[PDB]
Design a protein around this ligand. Structure first.
Ligand SMILES: OC[C@H]1O[C@@H](O[C@H]2[C@H](O)[C@@H](O)[C@H](O[C@H]3[C@H](O)[C@@H](O)[C@H](O[C@H]4[C@H](O)[C@@H](O)[C@H](O)O[C@@H]4CO)O[C@@H]3CO)O[C@@H]2CO)[C@H](O)[C@@H](O)[C@@H]1O
Length: 224
């Protein structure tokens, strides 16, 4: 690896991307740790991985290490035409409580900190070990060439929309996240004209299990 980010909130940035050893829930663990590795920045993308083992509090996320596309504050979702992104990944085992997911926060306050927002949009590409997203099942949705189970609920005051695969995982994926926002704007009254983009990330939420290793073979993200 080019860089090993094994410290709590170990951080790298470059080429308009960033990487964080985001162990935000680790104090709920009874044992374990996690490191995030920058493997490459080849071909306009990021190659990275994270290794971990966690015990304790099986409904509590211990971490969400991520790669993020850096964005400028004050961009209304309605004024973003496209958020094209692709990811290729593997997990070395699936007998773990973990997901792989895109995470996007938006807020009416354009200076909202990056830990949250008014709304969260997640696109889950894996759902291992019997975990649940925030909230309850809402409906099925056709987007990005697939069928999704949409779940909705609240994390504090933040409304969370999570799009889940009905079956299996999706280890090679590409989409335009604006298709997901546009669907929410039309059918869920999502206030895109007053919401600013806060973060644009992909990573893995880790609850319990391991030793496990997530490899992101390639990540690319743009927005226009
Ligand atoms: O909290 C500060 C922290 O936030 C990080 O971003 C989090 C979001 O805050 C969060 O909404 C979301 O994590 C969800 C996860 O998707 C769900 O699977 C999980 O669901 C739990 C649920 O909470 C329980 O009620 C239920 O009983 O069990 C299920 C699991 O089976 O809930 C969590 C939130 O608790 O996604 C984001 C990524 O982790 C930021 O990354 C960080 O910067 C902040 O400090």
């Amino acid at each position: 690896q080019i860089r090993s980010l094994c410290e709590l909130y170990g951080y790298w940035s470059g080429n308009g991307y960033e990487l964080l050893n985001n162990l935000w829930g680790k104090d709920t663990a009874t044992s374990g740790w996690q490191c995030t590795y920058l493997d490459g920045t080849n071909n306009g993308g990021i190659q990275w991985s994270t290794a971990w083992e966690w015990q304790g509090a099986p409904d509590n996320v211990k971490s969400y290490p991520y790669v993020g596309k850096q964005i400028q504050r004050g961009r209304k979702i309605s004024d973003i035409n496209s958020m094209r992104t692709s990811v290729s990944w593997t997990y070395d085992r699936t007998d773990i409580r973990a997901n792989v997911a895109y995470d996007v926060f938006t807020a009416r306050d354009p200076d909202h900190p990056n830990w949250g927002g008014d709304y969260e949009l997640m696109i889950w590409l894996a759902r291992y070990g019997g975990i649940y997203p925030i909230g309850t099942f809402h409906s099925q949705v056709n987007l990005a060439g697939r069928t999704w189970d949409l779940w909705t609920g609240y994390n504090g005051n933040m409304r969370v929309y999570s799009f889940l695969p009905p079956s299996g995982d999706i280890r090679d994926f590409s989409c335009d996240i604006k298709d997901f926002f546009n669907y929410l704007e039309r059918n869920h009254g999502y206030p895109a004209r007053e919401q600013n983009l806060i973060v644009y990330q992909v990573g893995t939420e880790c609850f319990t299990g391991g030793p496990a290793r997530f490899t992101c073979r390639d990540f690319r993200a743009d927005l226009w």
